[PDB]
Write an enzyme that holds these catalytic residues in place. Sequence first.
Site, PDB file in Angstrom:
ATOM      1  N   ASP A 121     -38.158   5.351  42.033  1.00  0.00           N
ATOM      2  CA  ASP A 121     -37.508   5.007  40.768  1.00  0.00           C
ATOM      3  C   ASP A 121     -36.880   6.322  40.345  1.00  0.00           C
ATOM      4  O   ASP A 121     -37.359   7.394  40.725  1.00  0.00           O
ATOM      5  CB  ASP A 121     -38.529   4.601  39.709  1.00  0.00           C
ATOM      6  N   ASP A 123     -36.787   7.555  37.312  1.00  0.00           N
ATOM      7  CA  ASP A 123     -37.463   8.152  36.159  1.00  0.00           C
ATOM      8  C   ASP A 123     -38.912   8.619  36.408  1.00  0.00           C
ATOM      9  O   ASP A 123     -39.668   8.868  35.462  1.00  0.00           O
ATOM     10  CB  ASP A 123     -37.423   7.132  35.012  1.00  0.00           C
ATOM     11  N   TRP A 183     -36.309  -7.909  36.629  1.00  0.00           N
ATOM     12  CA  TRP A 183     -37.508  -7.098  36.732  1.00  0.00           C
ATOM     13  C   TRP A 183     -38.731  -7.833  37.261  1.00  0.00           C
ATOM     14  O   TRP A 183     -38.932  -9.016  36.961  1.00  0.00           O
ATOM     15  CB  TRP A 183     -37.817  -6.524  35.352  1.00  0.00           C
ATOM     16  N   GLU A 186     -41.131  -7.796  43.105  1.00  0.00           N
ATOM     17  CA  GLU A 186     -40.696  -7.332  44.401  1.00  0.00           C
ATOM     18  C   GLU A 186     -41.738  -6.422  45.052  1.00  0.00           C
ATOM     19  O   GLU A 186     -41.962  -6.495  46.268  1.00  0.00           O
ATOM     20  CB  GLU A 186     -39.317  -6.642  44.311  1.00  0.00           C
ATOM     21  N   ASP A 187     -42.398  -5.586  44.261  1.00  0.00           N
ATOM     22  CA  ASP A 187     -43.401  -4.712  44.850  1.00  0.00           C
ATOM     23  C   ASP A 187     -44.563  -5.539  45.414  1.00  0.00           C
ATOM     24  O   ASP A 187     -45.064  -5.260  46.523  1.00  0.00           O
ATOM     25  CB  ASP A 187     -43.894  -3.674  43.834  1.00  0.00           C
ATOM     26  N   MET A 213     -43.394   9.367  33.731  1.00  0.00           N
ATOM     27  CA  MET A 213     -42.216   8.529  33.737  1.00  0.00           C
ATOM     28  C   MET A 213     -41.441   8.870  32.484  1.00  0.00           C
ATOM     29  O   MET A 213     -42.019   8.932  31.403  1.00  0.00           O
ATOM     30  CB  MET A 213     -42.539   7.040  33.715  1.00  0.00           C
ATOM     31  N   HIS A 216     -38.582   5.072  28.358  1.00  0.00           N
ATOM     32  CA  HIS A 216     -37.331   4.327  28.227  1.00  0.00           C
ATOM     33  C   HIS A 216     -37.528   2.883  27.785  1.00  0.00           C
ATOM     34  O   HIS A 216     -38.618   2.316  27.921  1.00  0.00           O
ATOM     35  CB  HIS A 216     -36.551   4.360  29.547  1.00  0.00           C
ATOM     36  N   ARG A 218     -36.150  -1.269  27.862  1.00  0.00           N
ATOM     37  CA  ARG A 218     -35.788  -2.099  29.003  1.00  0.00           C
ATOM     38  C   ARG A 218     -34.272  -2.244  29.074  1.00  0.00           C
ATOM     39  O   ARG A 218     -33.574  -2.070  28.075  1.00  0.00           O
ATOM     40  CB  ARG A 218     -36.453  -3.476  28.915  1.00  0.00           C
TER      41      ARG A 218
HETATM   42  O1  LIG Z   1     -30.569  -0.796  34.625  1.00  0.00           O
HETATM   43  C1  LIG Z   1     -31.294  -0.338  35.472  1.00  0.00           C
HETATM   44  C2  LIG Z   1     -32.557  -0.898  35.884  1.00  0.00           C
HETATM   45  C3  LIG Z   1     -33.258  -0.302  36.835  1.00  0.00           C
HETATM   46  N1  LIG Z   1     -32.836   0.900  37.501  1.00  0.00           N
HETATM   47  C4  LIG Z   1     -33.641   1.577  38.616  1.00  0.00           C
HETATM   48  O2  LIG Z   1     -34.763   0.727  38.689  1.00  0.00           O
HETATM   49  C5  LIG Z   1     -35.982   1.431  38.424  1.00  0.00           C
HETATM   50  C6  LIG Z   1     -36.642   0.987  37.230  1.00  0.00           C
HETATM   51  O3  LIG Z   1     -37.215  -0.133  36.726  1.00  0.00           O
HETATM   52  P1  LIG Z   1     -37.618   0.320  35.274  1.00  0.00           P
HETATM   53  O4  LIG Z   1     -37.904   1.784  35.267  1.00  0.00           O
HETATM   54  O5  LIG Z   1     -36.666  -0.047  34.209  1.00  0.00           O
HETATM   55  O6  LIG Z   1     -39.015  -0.500  34.959  1.00  0.00           O
HETATM   56  P2  LIG Z   1     -40.436  -0.067  35.319  1.00  0.00           P
HETATM   57  O7  LIG Z   1     -40.578   1.254  34.629  1.00  0.00           O
HETATM   58  O8  LIG Z   1     -41.263  -1.228  34.613  1.00  0.00           O
HETATM   59  O9  LIG Z   1     -40.578   0.214  36.781  1.00  0.00           O
HETATM   60  C7  LIG Z   1     -41.730  -0.356  37.480  1.00  0.00           C
HETATM   61  O10 LIG Z   1     -41.591  -1.814  37.693  1.00  0.00           O
HETATM   62  C8  LIG Z   1     -40.348  -2.168  38.456  1.00  0.00           C
HETATM   63  C9  LIG Z   1     -40.555  -3.670  38.421  1.00  0.00           C
HETATM   64  O11 LIG Z   1     -39.496  -4.464  38.906  1.00  0.00           O
HETATM   65  C10 LIG Z   1     -40.439  -1.457  39.838  1.00  0.00           C
HETATM   66  O12 LIG Z   1     -41.441  -2.065  40.588  1.00  0.00           O
HETATM   67  C11 LIG Z   1     -40.654   0.039  39.722  1.00  0.00           C
HETATM   68  O13 LIG Z   1     -40.741   0.478  41.082  1.00  0.00           O
HETATM   69  C12 LIG Z   1     -41.918   0.321  38.869  1.00  0.00           C
HETATM   70  O14 LIG Z   1     -42.069   1.752  38.804  1.00  0.00           O
HETATM   71  C13 LIG Z   1     -35.429   2.646  37.758  1.00  0.00           C
HETATM   72  O15 LIG Z   1     -36.405   3.665  37.643  1.00  0.00           O
HETATM   73  C14 LIG Z   1     -34.148   2.981  38.417  1.00  0.00           C
HETATM   74  O16 LIG Z   1     -34.384   3.719  39.632  1.00  0.00           O
HETATM   75  C15 LIG Z   1     -31.624   1.494  37.136  1.00  0.00           C
HETATM   76  O17 LIG Z   1     -31.266   2.518  37.695  1.00  0.00           O
HETATM   77  N2  LIG Z   1     -30.928   0.834  36.137  1.00  0.00           N
HETATM   78 MN   LIG Z   2     -39.333   3.092  34.501  1.00  0.00          MN
END
Ligand SMILES: O=c1ccn([C@@H]2O[C@H](COP(=O)(O)OP(=O)(O)O[C@H]3O[C@H](CO)[C@H](O)[C@H](O)[C@H]3O)[C@@H](O)[C@H]2O)c(=O)[nH]1
Ligand SMILES: [Mn+2]
EC number: 2.4.1.-
Length: 271
Positions: A121, A123, A183, A186-187, A213, A216, A218
């Site tokens: 990811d 972040d 969202w 997938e994992d 992290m 941020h 959604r």
């Molecule tokens: O508009 C967007 C949405 C997502 N992302 C990418 O997608 C990842 C992020 O998903 P979020 O950070 O928004 O949400 P989560 O923090 O809830 O992330 C977690 O849940 C997701 C669920 O779909 C993934 O499994 C991810 O690996 C896990 O760390 C980002 O970090 C980024 O790399 C973008 O770049 N832009």
């Molecule tokens: Mn995130």
Amino acid sequence: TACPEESPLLVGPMLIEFNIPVDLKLVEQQNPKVKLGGRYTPMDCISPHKVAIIIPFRNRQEHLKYWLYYLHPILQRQQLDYGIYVINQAGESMFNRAKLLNVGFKEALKDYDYNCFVFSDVDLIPMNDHNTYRCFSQPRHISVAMDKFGFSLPYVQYFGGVSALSKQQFLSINGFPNNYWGWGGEDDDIYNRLAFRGMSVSRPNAVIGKTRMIRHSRDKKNEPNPQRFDRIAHTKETMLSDGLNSLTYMVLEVQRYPLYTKITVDIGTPS
Ligand SMILES: O=c1ccn([C@@H]2O[C@H](COP(=O)(O)OP(=O)(O)O[C@H]3O[C@H](CO)[C@H](O)[C@H](O)[C@H]3O)[C@@H](O)[C@H]2O)c(=O)[nH]1
Ligand SMILES: [Mn+2]
């Protein structure tokens, strides 16, 4: 001239804060050894780890600035032969993280003979450089103790955040699914794939695998996918029909900045 099993450059725990004003020109200046496209190879030894670091992306430039600022010094200390790929989803429809990751795998390989893939990811930053961004005997889950989860695995099967699969491991599961829009899930689907292909998940201990992290909200087109629970139920039946063998997409543009390669792609829409 193999690199030692333990890099002499490692410092251990690190302070990760997001207040500092990050400037890519500076980061580039601080990391003179990393070459155009975010490429780096150890100068004094041969690393057996050739890793493509794949980052799904869309409207997260600020987080990306911090990711580069922190990981590049780290990755170099881990004495890895790596490349950074920012897979930017074009368009404004539903986000699709897993599909983007597949794209990064295919596109990175057209670049160099990577044998390892780290999916991260944008972040997430590691708090200890001993949490190596490389591949292992079994699929590797790297962000095992996230700050938002009180530094503890949410559930034994959780595979989100940062993970790494060798080329052979990724291929045995037909990559990730392309059919998870929005969202979530997938994992878990990927975990089913691993387990179904008889692999297990390797993890660094919680002491060295903590991550921060960047806080941020959604994103507008990345709403929870109501079909996820159902899809997770049928991974076994669908994994061989949805992944690498069915991946279709269109590269619209490529830009090689000094710190990473940006590949803009049109990956279609939910249907
Ligand atoms: O508009 C967007 C949405 C997502 N992302 C990418 O997608 C990842 C992020 O998903 P979020 O950070 O928004 O949400 P989560 O923090 O809830 O992330 C977690 O849940 C997701 C669920 O779909 C993934 O499994 C991810 O690996 C896990 O760390 C980002 O970090 C980024 O790399 C973008 O770049 N832009
Ligand atoms: Mn995130």
